[PDB]
Amino acid sequence: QCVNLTTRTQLPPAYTNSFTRGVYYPDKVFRSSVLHSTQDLFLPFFSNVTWFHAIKRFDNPVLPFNDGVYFASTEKSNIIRGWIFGTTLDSKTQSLLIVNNATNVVIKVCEFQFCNDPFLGVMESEFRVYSSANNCTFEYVSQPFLNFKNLREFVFKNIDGYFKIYSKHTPINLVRDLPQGFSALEPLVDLPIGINITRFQTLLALHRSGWTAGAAAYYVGYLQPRTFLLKYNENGTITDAVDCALDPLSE
Amino acid sequence: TKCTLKSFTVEKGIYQTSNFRVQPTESIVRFPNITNLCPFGEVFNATRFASVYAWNRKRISNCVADYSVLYNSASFSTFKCYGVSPTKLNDLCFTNVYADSFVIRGDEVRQIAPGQTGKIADYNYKLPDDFTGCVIAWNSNNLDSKVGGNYNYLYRLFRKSNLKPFERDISTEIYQAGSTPCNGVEGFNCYFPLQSYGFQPTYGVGYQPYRVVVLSFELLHAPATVCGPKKSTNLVKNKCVNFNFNGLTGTGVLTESNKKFLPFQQFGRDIDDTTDAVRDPQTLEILDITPCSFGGVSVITPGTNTSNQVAVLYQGVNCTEVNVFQTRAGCLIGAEHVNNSYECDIPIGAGICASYQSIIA
Amino acid sequence: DSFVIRGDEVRQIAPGQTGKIADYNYKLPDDFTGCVIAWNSNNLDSKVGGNYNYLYRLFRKSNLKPFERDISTEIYQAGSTPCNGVEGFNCYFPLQSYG
Amino acid sequence: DSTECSNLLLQYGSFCTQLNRALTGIAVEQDKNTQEVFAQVKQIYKTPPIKDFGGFNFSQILPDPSKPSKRSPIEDLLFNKVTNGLTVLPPLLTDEMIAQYTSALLAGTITSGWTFGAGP
Amino acid sequence: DSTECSNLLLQYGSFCTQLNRALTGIAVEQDKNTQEVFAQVKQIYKTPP
Amino acid sequence: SALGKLQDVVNQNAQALNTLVKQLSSNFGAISSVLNDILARLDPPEAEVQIDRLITGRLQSLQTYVTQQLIRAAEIRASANLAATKMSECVLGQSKRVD
Amino acid sequence: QIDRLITGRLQSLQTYVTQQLIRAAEIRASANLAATKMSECVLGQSKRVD
Ligand SMILES: *[C@@H]1O[C@H](CO)[C@@H](O[C@@H]2O[C@H](CO)[C@@H](O)[C@H](O)[C@H]2NC(C)=O)[C@H](O)[C@H]1NC(C)=O
Ligand SMILES: *[C@@H]1O[C@H](CO)[C@@H](O[C@@H]2O[C@H](CO)[C@@H](O)[C@H](O)[C@H]2NC(C)=O)[C@H](O)[C@H]1NC(C)=O
Ligand SMILES: *[C@@H]1O[C@H](CO)[C@@H](O)[C@H](O)[C@H]1NC(C)=O
Ligand SMILES: *[C@@H]1O[C@H](CO)[C@@H](O)[C@H](O)[C@H]1NC(C)=O
Ligand SMILES: *[C@@H]1O[C@H](CO)[C@@H](O)[C@H](O)[C@H]1NC(C)=O
Ligand SMILES: *[C@@H]1O[C@H](CO)[C@@H](O)[C@H](O)[C@H]1NC(C)=O
Ligand SMILES: *[C@@H]1O[C@H](CO)[C@@H](O)[C@H](O)[C@H]1NC(C)=O
Ligand SMILES: *[C@@H]1O[C@H](CO)[C@@H](O)[C@H](O)[C@H]1NC(C)=O
Ligand SMILES: *[C@@H]1O[C@H](CO)[C@@H](O)[C@H](O)[C@H]1NC(C)=O
């Protein structure tokens, strides 16, 4: 089942500063009180990240994946539920679906027929994100990952057919923009998908009481190949980082 | 020392002659719990099998497959592999496995083979010439056969062209035996392609129904989700053993660790990026990996003109891991430690010197 | 060292080759010096009814050493069950003839 | 611990012996350097218990009895301010004996002038 | 300027860093040598007219 | 920065050892920097080539380390000879040598 | 085969020349010290202690 949303208000996309966010653990290796220099797909410090709002604003476009995606979410009441990953987003090719419904998180790699406007609806009684599912190759059910009160950071990478999802939950009290601080993203799950992904789309949830969009805001950043100098404390958490290509001092 | 110096006479001094190694005693392989098994119970031992023209294809992926139980079962009358070895199924890894399940006649069991020509091979199930995987077949007279005749299992008898490998044909088009036009109406030379078998309990060997499952392996660029079983052994600590933890191998002494890992971290590295801490996959505990007590073996001797007595210094080696005295330089064997202080004759290290008067340190 | 093999197996009579007769019939060392000679013998080593006089070791527990010959006609145990010198389920003769 | 690697390494000859011998030469050279610098006296001199040197104070350079290491306050400050087949050999002279040699040199140059360097 | 050559050269590790460090050490050592030989006075003396 | 000369010697020695250790993680053109992975993933005819590449790379690294250690040893020996001269002439006597 | 022998022998010769140059530097330093001792101890009386 698909429904066209024809009540949107036209507005240009916003932009903001990444500050020192987007750092994640490059590997599953403990390091104690040491500085490690690593070359990987990292998000540049103080970069220009695209800012989308949900307020009548309902920002669900399809964007190129590039080499990786940094997703920042200033979220309250759990409007953002999942993501759409693929190349052509139709039954011709194979696409990846990430959903978090009221009970669990489901990760599926199948040939889905995506709607032009996919969404959920809130008691949750409205699922309108696909119309068909023909050939499934991989299914994985896991534990649920989840004023703006919650900050959700995610990093998605496609390296050697492995899909790395890094995530971090942060308690914030900032009203509008991204807070300034340091929080290293823990690795959450590695998926053996082995498929081509070039485009993605956020999945939102409607509020029914037409439809109303709950207050949420999210940010999209792009991963670039660069070097980071990570500092590991006594307890083994990354407390500070240096971008080797940002300015000559950090270089 | 004479061998190292290439001389039959050795001058007084200390000569580094060899390299002590603590030989590994045991091999400790720790791999995580063997869970998420592949559903082979519902394919080999299903309630109802499929026909050979519409063979059921089950995809085995994202699981660990225990081929030892399948291979060691004595019920199977035929276990023939054409691209791999039966004893190496538990060691190799594949991207995915295709399981083709069907029932055929006892005489047609040989027809599921590369290069074999038969009715089942040409019209029902075809294998490629470079086929990899294993064909398993077993008798099913006690279950499939019925006293009234089991006609549920159909098979294709006629088709214009031979099958391609891994191709199904469930079409029910009326075959043309001759050249007469047939528009779906049966006639003298137009018959239905699917015929029923005559499985009955009174038939002997060769006409009994045989259940065949064919496993095919894929080795594409996809990750190898399907792997063999992992036989984890017991964990031994405080000894120089060869450790294999989740594919990371090496040699070391595994001791208890006070380092508290975060839940996502598995291995531990020092400044020089060498693994000195690790997490056991079976039980979530942290173990320090101290390198084995390698050292330099030095021989302390006076001149051969004076005496043939020698002492052995194991550099940087504790005396419990090899006239035995423990120094900060290492373990010295063959020298009697005295409390008197003299001038240094042969330097040992860390303030220790050796002399001949027997050899004293 | 004289023997008769198939047409496609002549590449396996070489140093450092991976193969079936390389592992269980005739193994060459990595530092082998000498020459391998192969020529077609369809006119002499073939019969219309089938020349089955040439046999190869289909089954063995382990790969051979270089310049090692195995002529033992003992049964092979392919499974957990012992065979006791008698053919049966998962008990096959190691030597099979070329057709 | 790879036996195949060692078998292939034997084709290259006595490179390992040369590397070990060069490192051994460096290691004995360091001990010889310390011996040349600090062991220039064969008598261990001590200062008198009464530090009556005509008003001259040497407390900052003489060994401190309170410290277990028997180092001077300046030497203690200097030591505080300095922060796979690999082995580190200990030096032949420990820090205590080097401190003892410096103490003997200081006692000789304080109580005896330059006479101890040229004879009794 | 070959990117493929640099990609292959990165497989050999930190040889290039070692060589650059050694040359930098020699370069600063030459300046230290000149400083030690000629800059032994902190006052610029001048002869009388 | 009062004790920079000793700290420089300690830093150079530690950095040299660190560089040596880190040279083990480089494959030097081989498929992997781990000998065990090469021995487990390939047959001995090609594993011999890959191990030979690792051996020559590690041997070159070790020769480089020993050579730079010898050069630093010569520098330290010169400094120690100077220190012994200062010990003999400044501490054990009064020197008329300017500066 | 000759290429393998050439690279091995060339590496051996370069290593030998490298330690020969280092030993030459050490012997040159010792010879400079010996020349200084000949000038100051034999050709004059030295006030330098030891
Ligand atoms: C919502 O709008 C989209 C955009 O027009 C619709 O997608 C098109 O649907 C027609 C229906 O036949 C197709 O012919 C077009 O090819 C579609 N566009 C694209 C780009 O594929 C979509 O069908 C609408 N949803 C519903 C339920 O009508
Ligand atoms: C020699 O110098 C030391 C240090 O300068 C003197 O020790 C000081 O003595 C005064 C008074 O007794 C104390 O207030 C200081 O705290 C002492 N300093 C230290 C570092 O101990 C010492 O008195 C001087 N004279 C003699 C004869 O030793
Ligand atoms: C980010 O991009 C937008 C348009 O692409 C631009 O207007 C804005 O100035 C940029 N911000 C920064 C900090 O460069
Ligand atoms: C992935 O898809 C994009 C477009 O969808 C295509 O240009 C690219 O070649 C594909 N890559 C692979 C490895 O298939
Ligand atoms: C969540 O999704 C799973 C997978 O389809 C489904 O089994 C489950 O019933 C869903 N839960 C709810 C509350 O809809
Ligand atoms: C994909 O689905 C279509 C129809 O749903 C089917 O014809 C095709 O065989 C399927 N392919 C695979 C690889 O499962
Ligand atoms: C490290 O953990 C200890 C608890 O064992 C805690 O007291 C300390 O504050 C932590 N330090 C940091 C920098 O997180
Ligand atoms: C049926 O086959 C499965 C195959 O894995 C096996 O595990 C199971 O024990 C079998 N059941 C019986 C009753 O033989
Ligand atoms: C794995 O098996 C061990 C057996 O002792 C058990 O203690 C443990 O809870 C199991 N699960 C995990 C995740 O280690």
Numbering used by the authors:
A (entry chain B): 14 to 68, 77 to 143, 153 to 176, 185 to 247, 257 to 298
B (entry chain A): 299 to 620, 641 to 675, 691 to 694
C (entry chain C): 398 to 496
D (entry chain B): 745 to 827, 856 to 892
E (entry chain C): 745 to 793
F (entry chain B): 943 to 1041
G (entry chain A): 992 to 1041
Authors' description from the paper:
To this aim, ectodomains bearing variant spike mutations were used for cryo-EM structural studies. Global 3D reconstructions were obtained at resolutions ranging from (2.25–2.5 Å), yielding open trimers with one RBD in the up conformation and 2 RBDs in the down conformation for all spikes. Inspection of the structure of the Alpha variant shows that the A570D and S982A mutations appear to contribute protomer-specific structural effects with implications for RBD positioning. The D1118H mutation within the Alpha variant enables local side chain rearrangements, giving rise to additional interprotomer contacts, via pi-cation interactions between R1091 and H1118 of adjacent protomers, and electrostatic interactions between R1091 and adjacent E1092 residues. Superposition of wild-type and Alpha spike models clearly demonstrates the differential positioning of H1118 compared to D1118, and the resulting movement of adjacent R1091 towards E1092.
Given its crucial role in the viral replicative cycle, the spike protein represents an important therapeutic target and is a critical antigen in host immune responses.
